[PDB]
Write a protein that binds this ligand. Structure first.
Ligand code: DGD
Ligand code: CLA
Ligand code: CLA
Ligand code: CLA
Ligand code: PHO
Ligand code: LMG
Ligand code: SQD
Ligand code: LHG
Ligand code: BCR
Ligand code: BCR
Ligand code: LMT
Ligand code: HTG
Ligand code: HTG
Ligand code: CA
Ligand code: CA
Ligand code: FE2
Ligand code: MG
Lengths: 38, 30, 30, 37, 34, 81, 341, 39, 65, 504, 34, 34, 37, 30
């Protein structure tokens, strides 16, 4: 389909939020389960 | 090993799906 | 002799600073 | 004897003299402790 | 007007495909308990 | 430009997202299962948390012989009963 | 215009990612080195080679994952997948440290590939190949540290392992065992890296602060045209500034930029020479005069003898876990310790 | 006599030849198909 | 330039500067030898490395007394 | 004018003066060899090949003379400890003299080729310009190299017409120069088989002859002539530099790991023989064979050759040195005089205890004694207040077998401890530390110094290769890029093929 | 201190030889026709 | 023999310093025009 | 800065160099025994 | 090192003989 239909700023915002989510998960894992020292 | 099929089923389903969606443009290109 | 050598090299370097700065070839615009 | 046409003058300007002397003197200041050991 | 399957396309995907697979794995790993 | 379509175009196109809203989650889920099924452990020979030591053992199973190293590791694994 | 030339044509097309003849060496080896590192650090242990966990799968984080070197008992085995050790078994091969040799060797050929790429593109575009030449320093460092250094030692085991904390360990090991900071080749290295950093900083800042006003904007980046003929900053003002601030100043731009190539490149080459020495334990470890004096005179103390005490601590406290093949058992009473600690 | 490691060496040799061969077959083929246009 | 006896003798050995064989000439053959040479090195390396282990070839000081 | 780092470029289009400069370089190198041999002869002590061999004395060129069969002095001694031998002219002294004279003659030749640089031979007959036909020159020189290589293998090494080469037993006890027959089976590619060095020079020689003839008779393909710039002498500079750093890495490697061409009697033992306790294993084997034949402990250890014991000592490990710890190994621990004999340690219960040996990595090492199972039984403690394993507490004694201390036993803790301290280095020796004012700090052997210099030089010559390869292939722009370089050549998508204007 | 006795001559030649090389080149450059 | 330990550097500098002075003078003379 | 009119070029011809070097080397050959003592 | 010094100086003197004879500035008649 045609390029430009979805605003680049939306794509950027969503992508960024996904990044923050996955990294947030990895930092959660530093405190839970393996690697938590507990 | 059932685990390799349970695991690499999403990969091949993705490949098959995108092949389905891009087939006409791929044929047009080739 | 060691001390004399170390201080001598250092002294030469300081003298070099002096000539490099005050007796440099002057930059000239073209 | 006929003169060799491959000769060229050699140069070292003053800045190169100063840089070179800095390199030599500083390398000496660095390496001398090891030469004395 | 533009091709789809180029050298760039390949390069991009040889990096991007394994990266998403791997991130899925590491994600799963965050819930492993000793 | 070098002839390929601009990325700006592609990633803001509807079709791109019809494709990749399937293909990216599929890959992600595949990797997830590669871990959750435990296949990763077996493919790469990595110890599960209960397979580093036998119960009353406290000696690392270090490889000490170059050419019979494989057999060594195998014996080490059997030692976990 | 036969097949060789048709191929040449295709390899040298002006696409988003340039390929070239050199790309045939470079891309698979670079891809396998990167992928090998990521595979190893994500999924692969170091239990059987080091007695270490080293993967995300085992619970390590970004700072502690590594692809670790093989067991010391492997010596300098190429440790090929089809070799006499793994014998074709991918899993065993991972357990034996095959990924380390995989990554280092594919990596080395990848670096060759990349430098060849620098030559190839420079030749195609019509510039002098000084970028490639500069890249010889990365090469010297990689080859001296990852290949020559372990080759001089007992085995690949004492090469650096590919990981953040693993590299940190490599550093601390070199201090404790080699007194590497004392080494004049390392020192020349440090001077080249810190001097390079200084040149980077000072040149960038100087250019940015002797700009001509070439626009009306207070954000001044747009007031430059890539095609423009004129210098975008004042070399004369720069020269007077630094002349009056520091006593000396660049006046030749060509010399300035050559010098910027020369300092860090030379630094890295020197550091390489030092590590080649450490491959044989040919260290700058001690000053003999220092030791004769200190041995005879128990009140003589310098920072040099202080640091050796530190080194002695490092060796004794780190060796048993860092060198498990040695089976070191150092009873409590023999561990070197100062008062209380 | 062909020891296990000589056999392994032949396997390595063969595998390398296959990788390089397939690589150049595909590169030459693609180069043949998509030619540069000159005037 | 100065002629000498020995010079006159050797003159033909330095008279074909820039002379080439048309096109690719013997490059294919050369390539073959290069290939062989690579494999050759690969062998000796692997023998020295104990990656390639042959009967009667003990890569140690204890090879022969 | 020419910048200082380019002064020698004046040789590029002057074959005569280039040959002169090469003659002068060769003169300088032959002169160095001669001088070095004279200096080593002025400092070498030939009186004890067992405990004071050449590699303990910082000898660098003496082992290379020995390797190919120069083993005697005009003064009457030999490196294998013989006396009353007539070496003929080709003694160490003869070789040094030969090199000095060669150096002189090369000097004179250099003066001649410098003055008479303008020989017609160096001129292209068609253009009148200086020109060297490098491909044919390569053929000629490769042919000659081939002949020489072949003759060296077929006559020298074989002893057919020549001395042969240095060979020894697997423990470097009985080395000597021998004729060696070529090895044509696969073991020929075993680095520890000298028959392979022989077969190598014969076969590689023949190949070099054949290839040489090829390169004399067949012109370069135009495509390779162009690609490699075979009209330009710097191309030869680049590929030669590459060949040379390859060869240097190789000799560094075989020097460090050992081979038939780096015998331990000439260069010293390797580090890997310490790592794997090569010598200790052989010694233990011999002692055991002795006991099983009915010998007493004293007898068994007394039957161990001092030379063998001396290999089992870390002071001869090439990996124990320092970059600025200069000179011969003798300057460190001293001139070895005698084996003290094998130390056996026992505790009050009469259990044998074994001292943990120092690994090469460690400048200093603790003193720990275990039983035959690795269980710690005694040590020298740092902190004393909670010591459990002190020699005093455990009643550790040391009894010596073989050597000068044979049949003796020590029980006072200080003496016992001193000996334990030395036991971390392997077998124990008496040293003369006075003659040289030795400082007690380990230095490396010629194996180590050779390995170091050659790995370093190899690495630097990599840069040499890179630089001159670049100079060769980018000759057209090394003064700058085309001042009229069209922006379209470096723009993107203007040409289909990078830098190919015919692809617009 | 028991320093190495060649250390002095080593440092002296290490400085003097190349420095002298540079001084020779510089002086003969200056004296060339302006 | 027990020679004076400064004999070596003394002799070396005795040779080198004035020899070098002369070499400088000579070379800058040759490089002058005409 | 006005150039100084009192300046003068300096010369050492080759024969003077050979004489000088000879003088230095022969002096050194003579006094060195006494420097080592 | 004393011996090396004596012999070095001597050797340099011989070298100098060589240059002073064969590389002298040629006498020329006006
Ligand atoms: C720069 C531009 C290039 C850019 C980068 C290009 C990257 C290319 C990649 C090349 C890979 C090289 C692999 C080298 C493997 C090796 O070395 O493997 C080492 C083996 C030697 O094997 C070792 O041998 C040792 C000693 O053994 C001997 O001694 C023992 C104890 O006495 C026993 O007797 C034993 O049986 C006997 O073999 C130990 O056994 C070790 O465990 C064992 O690993 O040698 C060998 O394969 C071959 C040795 C000879 C040739 C080596 C030349 C190349 C390396 C030069 C650098 C050397 C470093 C010197 C130190 C400085
Ligand atoms: C050009 C790119 C390139 C290069 C330079 C390398 C180089 C290497 N690879 Mg990698 N690899 C590559 C691409 C590359 N690879 C690709 C695309 C893959 C995916 C398949 C791999 C997958 C891979 C694995 C799994 C492994 C390697 C390994 C290696 C190392 C050993 C290779 C070897 O001994 O080959 C030997 C073969 C040759 C040198 C081929 C030359 C053949 C000659 C020229 C022609 C003659 C052939 C002859 C006709 C065949 C007769 C066969 C008969 C005798 C039966 C070496 C560093 C090993 C390693 O790193 O161990 C630590 C290893 O385990 N590679
Ligand atoms: C291939 C080179 C080589 C090797 C491996 C050897 C090996 C040996 N030599 Mg020999 N020697 C050589 C060449 C070599 N030599 C040459 C060319 C000469 C003429 C000067 C000599 C003259 C000589 C004498 C007079 C003696 C020896 C001795 C020895 C033995 C002791 C070595 C030692 O203490 O080194 C010490 C090594 C070092 C301290 C390393 C120096 C590192 C330098 C200074 C680094 C330079 C850094 C540089 C300035 C950086 C610039 C950076 C810039 C690019 C920015 C050892 C077996 C000794 C012996 O035992 O005789 C029996 C001895 O007395 N040699
Ligand atoms: C076969 C060996 C070899 C030969 C014949 C040459 C020849 C040349 N080089 Mg190359 N080069 C080589 C190896 C070689 N190089 C190596 C190993 C490197 C890396 C170190 C280089 C790096 C290099 C660079 C960066 C440059 C050259 C340049 C040149 C050209 C001018 C040289 C000159 O006038 O220097 C004059 C040198 C001096 C007046 C004094 C140098 C003093 C050195 C640094 C310290 C003392 C050296 C010591 C005596 C060496 C002892 C022997 C050694 C083997 C241990 C000339 C064609 C230049 C060029 O291309 O110009 C167009 C140039 O810029 N070379
Ligand atoms: C750790 C420090 C360090 C890193 C990470 C680094 C990285 C890089 N330098 C490059 C270039 C350069 N660096 C240069 C001078 C320097 N570079 C320096 C130090 C570094 N340079 C220093 C100190 C200097 C001054 C002398 C120059 C002159 C260049 C370039 O021209 C080039 C560039 O274009 O920069 C913009 C790029 C080459 C890309 C490439 O080869 O693709 C191919 C990738 C390959 C072949 C894979 C290599 C595999 C490696 C060798 C082993 C595996 C490594 C793992 C994947 C990761 C392990 C991570 C753990 C250690 C934690 C890359 C971004
Ligand atoms: C589409 C684009 C495709 C791009 C492909 C790019 C390929 C190369 C990518 C390399 C990435 C390397 C970093 C991976 C980190 C990771 O996954 O951590 C994975 C870890 C996983 O988290 C760990 O998981 C374990 C599960 O058993 C345990 O729970 C541990 O406790 C927990 O820490 O995440 C973290 O450590 C959190 C911080 C991550 C920060 C990343 C590093 C940032 C700086 C990097 C600098 C290097 C340059 C990178 C540039 C890109
Ligand atoms: C691990 C085992 C390894 C063994 C080796 C196996 C792989 C060998 C190496 C292959 C590396 C490159 C493969 C992809 C090449 C490619 O994408 O060409 C793209 C071409 C042409 O597309 C065309 O591409 C052109 C753009 S460009 O060339 O991509 O820049 C464009 O001009 C044109 O219009 C368009 O149709 O399409 C193909 O036919 C691909 C062939 C299959 C690959
Ligand atoms: C606004 C954010 C500022 C961040 C901190 C400052 C960054 C720049 C400071 C460098 C000074 C160098 C020496 C002078 C060099 C010099 O003279 O600069 C000159 C340069 C150009 O100046 P101009 O006059 O064109 O513009 C600046 C003002 O005049 C307003 O237009 O200044 C800038 O580009 C400002 C950039 C602001 C935005 C920069 C953000 C970058 C950092 C983002 C955070 C990264 C953190 C990473 C951690 C993992
Ligand atoms: C080894 C091997 C191989 C290979 C494989 C491969 C090739 C792989 C690849 C792989 C891959 C290719 C992977 C990837 C991955 C990725 C990842 C895992 C990522 C992650 C990321 C992240 C985590 C991010 C982060 C960040 C940053 C970096 C910065 C910004 C911010 C953030 C934080 C976001 C083969 C088979 C040949 C053979 C055998 C061996
Ligand atoms: C003329 C004549 C003659 C004579 C001759 C002669 C006598 C010669 C001599 C010669 C000689 C006697 C020579 C020598 C040489 C030497 C050399 C050439 C050396 C060099 C060195 C170097 C180069 C070094 C360097 C270094 C250093 C110093 C430090 C450390 C590092 C290094 C190693 C780098 C006769 C009668 C025979 C006959 C004919 C005529
Ligand atoms: C103990 C360590 C000492 C190290 C000693 C190092 C020795 C270095 C010798 C350098 C030789 C200098 O070489 C010298 O170059 C200059 C130009 O540069 C030449 O001079 C020539 O060029 C200039 C400029 O066109 C003319 O004015 C001049 O008339 C002409 O003869 C000299 O004829 C030559 O003798
Ligand atoms: C490596 C490159 C070897 C080129 S091979 C070359 O190829 C041509 C067609 O491309 C043929 O016409 C020619 O006969 C052949 O020698
Ligand atoms: C330039 C010095 C020439 C001196 C020549 C002295 C010859 S010496 C002569 O040489 C023969 C060959 O080795 C020996 O067989 C013989 O015993 C020996 O006396
Ligand atoms: Ca649990
Ligand atoms: Ca003393
Ligand atoms: Fe700049
Ligand atoms: Mg966790």
């Amino acid at each position: 389909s045609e390029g430009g239909r979805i605003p680049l700023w939306i794509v950027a915002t969503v992508a960024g939020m996904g990044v923050i989510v996955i990294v947030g998960l990895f930092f959660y894992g530093a405190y839970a389960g393996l690697g938590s020292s507990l | 090993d059932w685990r390799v099929l349970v695991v690499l089923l999403p990969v091949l389903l993705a490949a098959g799906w995108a092949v389905r969606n891009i087939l006409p443009y791929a044929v047009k290109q080739v | 002799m060691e001390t004399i050598t170390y201080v001598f090299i250092f002294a030469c370097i300081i003298a070099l600073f002096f000539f490099a700065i005050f007796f440099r070839e002057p930059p000239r615009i073209t | 004897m006929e003169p060799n046409p491959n000769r060229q003058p050699v140069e070292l300007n003053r800045t190169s003299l100063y840089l070179g002397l800095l390199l030599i003197l500083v390398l000496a200041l660095l390496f001398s402790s090891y030469f004395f050991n | 007007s533009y091709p789809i399957f180029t050298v760039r396309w390949v390069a991009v995907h040889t990096l991007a495909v394994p990266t998403i697979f791997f991130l899925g794995a590491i994600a799963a790993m965050q819930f492993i308990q000793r | 430009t070098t002839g390929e379509r601009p990325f700006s175009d592609i990633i803001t196109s509807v079709r791109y997202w019809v494709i990749h809203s399937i293909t990216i989650p599929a890959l992600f889920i595949a990797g997830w299962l590669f871990v959750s099924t435990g296949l990763a452990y077996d493919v790469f020979g990595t110890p599960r948390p209960d397979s580093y030591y036998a119960q009353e053992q406290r000696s690392i199973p270090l490889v000490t012989d170059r050419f019979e190293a494989k057999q060594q590791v195998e014996t080490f694994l059997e030692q976990l009963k | 215009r036969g097949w060789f030339d048709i191929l040449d044509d295709w390899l040298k097309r002006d696409r988003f990612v340039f390929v070239g003849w050199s790309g045939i060496l470079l891309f698979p080896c670079a891809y396998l080195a990167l992928g090998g590192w990521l595979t190893g650090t994500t999924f692969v242990t170091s239990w059987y080679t080091h007695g270490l966990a080293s993967s995300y799968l085992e619970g390590c984080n970004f700072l502690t994952v590594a692809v670790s070197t093989p067991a010391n008992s492997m010596g300098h085995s190429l440790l090929l997948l089809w070799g006499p050790e793994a014998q074709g078994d991918f899993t065993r091969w991972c357990q034996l440290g095959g990924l380390w040799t995989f990554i280092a060797l594919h990596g080395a050929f990848g670096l060759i590939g990349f430098m060849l790429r620098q030559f190839e593109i420079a030749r195609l575009v019509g510039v002098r190949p000084y970028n490639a030449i500069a890249f010889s320093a990365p090469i010297a460092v990689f080859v001296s540290v990852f290949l020559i250094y372990p080759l001089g030692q007992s085995s690949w085991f004492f090469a650096p392992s590919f990981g953040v904390a693993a590299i940190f360990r490599f550093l601390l090991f070199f201090q404790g065992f080699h007194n590497w900071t004392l080494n004049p080749f390392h020192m020349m290295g440090v001077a080249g890296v810190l001097g390079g950093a200084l040149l980077c900083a000072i040149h960038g800042a100087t250019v940015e602060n002797t700009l001509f006003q070439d626009g009306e904007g207070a954000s001044t980046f747009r007031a430059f045209n890539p095609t423009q003929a004129e210098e975008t900053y004042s070399m004369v003002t720069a020269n007077r500034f630094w002349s009056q601030i520091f006593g000396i100043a660049f006046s030749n731009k060509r010399w300035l930029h050559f010098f910027m190539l020369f300092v860090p490149v030379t630094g890295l080459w020197m550091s390489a020479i030092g590590v080649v020495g450490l491959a044989l334990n040919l260290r700058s470890y001690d000053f003999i005069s220092q030791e004769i004096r200190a041995a005879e005179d128990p009140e003589f103390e310098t920072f040099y003898t202080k640091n050796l005490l530190l080194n002695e601590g490092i060796r004794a406290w780190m060796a048993p876990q860092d060198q498990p093949h040695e089976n070191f058992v150092f009873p409590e009473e023999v561990l070197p310790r100062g008062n209380a600690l | 006599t062909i020891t296990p490691s000589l056999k392994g060496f032949f396997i390595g040799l063969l595998s390398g030849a296959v990788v390089l061969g397939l690589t150049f077959a595909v590169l030459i083929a693609i180069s043949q198909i998509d030619k540069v246009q000159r005037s | 330039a100065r002629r000498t006896w020995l010079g006159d003798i050797l003159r033909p050995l330095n008279s074909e500067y820039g002379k080439v064989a048309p096109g690719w000439g013997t490059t294919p053959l050369m390539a073959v030898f290069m290939g062989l040479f690579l494999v050759f090195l690969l062998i000796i390396l692997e023998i020295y490395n104990s990656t390639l282990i042959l009967d009667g070839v003990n890569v140690s000081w204890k090879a022969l007394g | 004018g020419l910048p200082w780092y380019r002064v020698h470029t004046v040789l590029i289009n002057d074959p005569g003066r280039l040959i002169a400069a090469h003659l002068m370089h060769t003169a300088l190198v032959a002169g160095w060899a001669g001088s070095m041999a004279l200096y080593e002869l002025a400092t070498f002590d030939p009186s004890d090949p067992v405990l004071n061999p050449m590699w303990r004395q910082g000898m660098f060129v003496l082992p290379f003379m020995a390797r190919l069969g120069v083993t005697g002095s005009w003064s009457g001694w030999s490196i294998t400890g013989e006396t009353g031998i007539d070496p003929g002219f080709w003694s160490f002294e003869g070789v040094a003299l030969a090199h000095i004279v060669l150096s002189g003659l090369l000097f004179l030749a250099a003066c001649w080729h410098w003055v008479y640089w303008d020989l017609e031979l160096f001129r292209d007959p068609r253009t009148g310009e200086p020109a060297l036909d490098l491909p044919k020159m390569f053929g000629i020189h490769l042919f000659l190299a081939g002949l020489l290589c072949f003759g060296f293998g077929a006559f020298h090494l074989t002893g057919l017409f020549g001395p042969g080469m240095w060979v020894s037993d697997p423990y470097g006890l009985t080395g000597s120069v021998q004729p060696v027959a070529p090895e044509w089976g696969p073991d020929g590619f075993n680095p520890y088989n000298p028959g392979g060095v022989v077969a190598h020079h014969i076969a590689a020689g023949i190949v070099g002859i054949i290839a040489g003839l090829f390169h004399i008779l067949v012109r370069p393909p135009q495509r390779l002539y162009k690609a490699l710039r075979m009209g330009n002498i710097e191309t030869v500079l680049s590929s030669s530099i590459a060949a040379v750093f390859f060869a240097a890495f190789v000799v560094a490697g075989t020097m460090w790991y050992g081979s038939a061409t780096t015998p331990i009697e000439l260069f010293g033992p390797t580090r890997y023989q310490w790592d794997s306790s090569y010598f200790q294993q052989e010694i233990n084997r011999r002692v055991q064979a002795s006991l099983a034949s009915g010998a007493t402990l004293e007898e068994a250890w007394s039957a161990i050759p001092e030379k063998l014991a001396f290999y089992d000592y870390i002071g001869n490990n090439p990996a124990k040195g320092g970059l600025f710890r200069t000179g011969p190994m003798n300057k460190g621990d001293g001139i070895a005089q005698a084996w003290k004999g094998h130390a056996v340690f026992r505790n009050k219960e009469g259990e044998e205890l074994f001292v943990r040996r120092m690994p090469a990595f460690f400048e200093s090492f603790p003193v720990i004694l275990t039983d035959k199972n690795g269980v710690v039984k005694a040590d020298i403690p740092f902190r004393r207040a909670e010591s459990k394993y002190s020699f005093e507490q455990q009643g550790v004694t040391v009894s010596f077998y073989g050597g000068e201390l044979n049949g003796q036993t020590f029980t006072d803790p200080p003496t016992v401890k001193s000996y334990a301290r030395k036991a971390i280095f392997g077998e124990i020796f008496e040293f003369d530390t006075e003659t040289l004012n030795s400082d007690g700090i380990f230095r490396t052997s010629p194996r180590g110094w050779f390995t170091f210099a050659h790995a370093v030089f190899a690495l630097l010559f990599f840069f040499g290769h890179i630089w001159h390869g670049a100079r060769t292939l980018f000759r057209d722009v090394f003064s700058g890029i085309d001042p009229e370089l069209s922006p379209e050549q470096v723009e993107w998508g203007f040409y289909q093929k990078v830098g190919d204007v015919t692809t617009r | 201190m028991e320093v190495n006795q060649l250390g002095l001559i080593a440092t002296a030649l290490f400085v003097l030889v190349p420095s002298v090389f540079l001084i020779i080149l510089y002086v003969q450059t200056e004296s060339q026709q302006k």
